[PDB]
Every structure is written in C-alpha cells, then in structure tokens.
Curated annotation (Swiss-Prot), chains B, C:
Chain's gene name: LONP1
Location in the cell: Mitochondrion matrix
Domains as described in the record: The Lon N-terminal domains are crucial for the overall structure of the protein, maintaining it in a conformation allowing its proper functioning. The AP-domain (ATP-binding and proteolytic domains) has a closed-ring conformation in the presence of AMP-PNP and its N-terminal entry gate appears closed. Upon ADP binding, it switches to a lock-washer conformation and its N-terminal gate opens.
Name this protein carries in UniProt: Lon protease homolog, mitochondrial
Parent-protein residues present: 760 to 809 of 959
Sequence similarity: Belongs to the peptidase S16 family.
Subunit structure: Homohexamer. Organized in a ring with a central cavity. The ATP-binding and proteolytic domains (AP-domain) form a hexameric chamber, while the N-terminal domain is arranged as a trimer of dimers. DNA and RNA binding is stimulated by substrate and inhibited by ATP binding. Interacts with TWNK and mitochondrial DNA polymerase subunit POLG.
Coiled-coil positions: none
Result for mutant: residue 11 to P: Has normal basal, but low stimulated ATPase activity, and abolishes peptidase activity
Result of altering residue 11 to A: Has low basal, but normal stimulated ATPase activity, and retains peptidase activity
Spans through the membrane: none
Domain of life: Eukaryota
Disease: CODAS syndrome: A rare syndrome characterized by the combination of cerebral, ocular, dental, auricular, and skeletal features. These include developmental delay, craniofacial anomalies, cataracts, ptosis, median nasal groove, delayed tooth eruption, hearing loss, short stature, delayed epiphyseal ossification, metaphyseal hip dysplasia, and vertebral coronal clefts.
Length: 100, 50, 50
C-alpha cells in the first residue's frame, strides 16, 4: 500500500503539471491522506485509482460527481490494469445508491 | 510510450515474462537553473537490497 | 584498465578470485571553483559494515 500510494502520488503530481501547469498546490503542500483499512491485502492496490482522483479534486476544488464509485490499479504512466473479485464489489456497491 | 519505458525480459519463477520498467519526472525541473542540489531518485517496486 | 579501476585479489568462501574494483565521478566536479563542501564518498557493492 505504501508503494502504490507513492507511485500514485507521483503520477498525480505529474499529471497536474501535464494538464494545468499554473496550479502548483500539490508540488508544495504537506497533505495528509487517509485510506481506511478493510480491503483484502492482496486486493489492496485495487483502490489506487481512487486516490489519484481524490487528490486531483482537492487540487482543483471541484467536489466529485454524486454517488460515483470507481476502482482499479494504476501505473506510473497511467495504464490501468485489471483487478479481481469484481462480483463482490458490484453486489456491495449496488446497494449503496451508486449509479455510475 | 515515447518518453520513459522499455520492455524488459525477465526470468520469472515460471517461464519468462515481459516486465516494463517505468520512470517519470517528479517535480518542476527549473525552479532555479543556477542552483546545485542533485536530483535524488526514488526507486520503487519492492526491490531487494541488491 | 581505463583509469580508476584496479585488480584486487580476494579470498572468498572457496578459493581466491580476481574481482576488479571500480570508481567514478558522480556529478561534474567544477560546480564551483569557490565551493567548500566535503566531496563525500558513496560506497556501493553490498558492503559489510567493517
């Protein structure tokens, strides 16, 4: 998890200068981040993609779109990868009111 | 991808495999062109010490 | 044997062996003619503490 967190951070800091160069909130700002425990450890990287948007939201100030869950692993250049156990994930998120 | 990857063969425990090594910039490069504080690496991938 | 490399005998666990030893610059040297900071060594090669 520490590994995936670091690489996700670097990808975030890279994407922002790639996309919106003037903003620099993330290059210079101590930032605590909190990921609650509970994911099965082998599945633990699967949440990575969410972080990368989390941070980006804070870096632009727009709250995310309503009730829109997401998952999946990310790489340093942003090539998302398959994740297992989709069935449990779908059945659990269905009843939370998520729609997209 | 043109900037920062190269396919790398590796002798995984079962068969061969084609891992990609990936590298990227970490901070704006030229905040002070005239300074002298060498750019540290941060390596990842759960490498062993060797 | 281009400069800064030398042979070195070593008595490993089973017999001797003629492993080389190598050294190199890490940053361009003349960053500042006026500079004054230790030119710190950085050892590498699975060093034992001794």
């Amino acid at each position: 998890m520490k590994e995936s967190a670091r690489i996700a951070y670097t990808f975030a800091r890279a994407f922002l200068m790639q996309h919106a160069p003037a903003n620099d909130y993330l290059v210079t700002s101590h930032i605590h981040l909190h990921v609650p425990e509970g994911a099965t450890p082998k599945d633990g990287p699967s949440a990575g993609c969410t972080i990368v948007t989390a941070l980006l939201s804070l870096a632009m100030g727009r709250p995310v779109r309503q009730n829109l869950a997401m998952t999946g692993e990310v790489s340093l250049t942003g090539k998302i990868l398959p994740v297992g156990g989709i069935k449990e994930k779908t059945i659990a998120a269905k009843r939370a009111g998520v729609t997209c | 991808t043109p900037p920062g990857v190269v396919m790398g063969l590796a002798w995984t425990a079962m068969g061969g495999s084609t891992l990609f090594v990936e590298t990227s910039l970490r901070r704006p490069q030229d905040k002070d062109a005239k300074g002298d504080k060498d750019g540290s690496l941060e390596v990842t991938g759960q490498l062993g010490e060797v």
